[PDB]
């Protein structure tokens, strides 16, 4: 069993974005747990990949970029992104945003 | 795409010979997810998920409070902002020794169900 404070993990199309792989394929067989910290004004550009995302918003107000248009979510929201669905993320606030993001092994890390 | 408040998922009361004082939400389940499932557990004060094992892993992130983790031997407490990886077939359990509700995200591969 691994028990650890997330922030202590060294971080690894994006601006103003810290990506931590908390549980990677180093340890886990099937899927990966990442922690993303988006500074004010940070951006993950719209993209699409042939694997899903499962996300939980931990802190702040997150702009979710969609195929057309956008939606704002906040702490305590989850997000499912189907494989190949267009998605991006932006921090349109004065405050840090943080979310958990999990992908299956085919997405690598 | 699904974008929803986790608390809006109706929690199920979990009550077994090994679980007391626990509620569970399936946030992202097999209806949508091809590979793994996102659950949110709420442990009431004094609640217990006793030691057990299953042939799939857990990936956990603690959302709120102080979680007592029951290990193969002994116990360790973690808090909000900790993650936990439990290997397949590793003994593990959880207890809430505090006077407020504890919450954690818990993800399992689809072979574990929901
Ligand atoms: Os993506
Ligand atoms: Os378990």
TrEMBL record, chain A:
It comes from the Bacteria. Keywords: Metal-binding, Zinc. Cu(2+) 5 binds at residue 85. Residues 35-102 form the Cupin type-2 domain. Mn(2+) binds at residues 47, 49, 53, 87. Zn(2+) binds at residues 47, 49, 53, 87. Cu(2+) 4 binds at residues 53, 87. The modification Cysteine sulfinic acid (-SO2H) is found at residue 101. Pfam families: Cupin_2. The keyword Chaperone does not apply. Cu(2+) 2 binds at residues 47, 87. This is Cupin type-2 domain-containing protein. It comes from Thermotoga maritima (strain ATCC 43589 / DSM 3109 / JCM 10099 / NBRC 100826 / MSB8).
Automatic annotation (TrEMBL), chain B:
Fe(3+) binds at residues 52, 54, 58, 92. GO terms for molecular function: metal ion binding. Mn(2+) binds at residues 52, 54, 58, 92. Residues 40-107 form the Cupin type-2 domain. InterPro entries: Cupin_2, RmlC-like_jellyroll, RmlC_Cupin_sf. Pfam families: Cupin_2. Zn(2+) binds at residues 52, 54, 58, 92. Cu(2+) 1 binds at residues 52, 54, 58, 92. Keywords: Metal-binding, Zinc. Cu(2+) 4 binds at residues 58, 92. This is Cupin type-2 domain-containing protein.
């Amino acid at each position: 069993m691994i028990l650890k404070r997330a922030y202590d993990v060294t971080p690894q199309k994006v601006r103003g974005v810290r990506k931590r792989v908390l549980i990677g394929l180093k340890d886990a067989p099937n899927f990966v747990m990442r922690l993303f910290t988006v500074e004010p004004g940070g951006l993950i550009d719209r993209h699409s990949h042939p694997w899903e995302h499962e996300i939980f918003v931990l802190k702040g107000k997150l702009t979710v970029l969609k195929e057309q248009g956008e939606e704002t979510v906040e702490e305590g929201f989850y997000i499912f992104v189907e494989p190949n669905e267009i998605h991006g993320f932006r921090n349109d606030t004065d405050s840090e945003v943080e979310f958990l993001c999990l992908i299956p092994k085919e997405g690598g890390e």
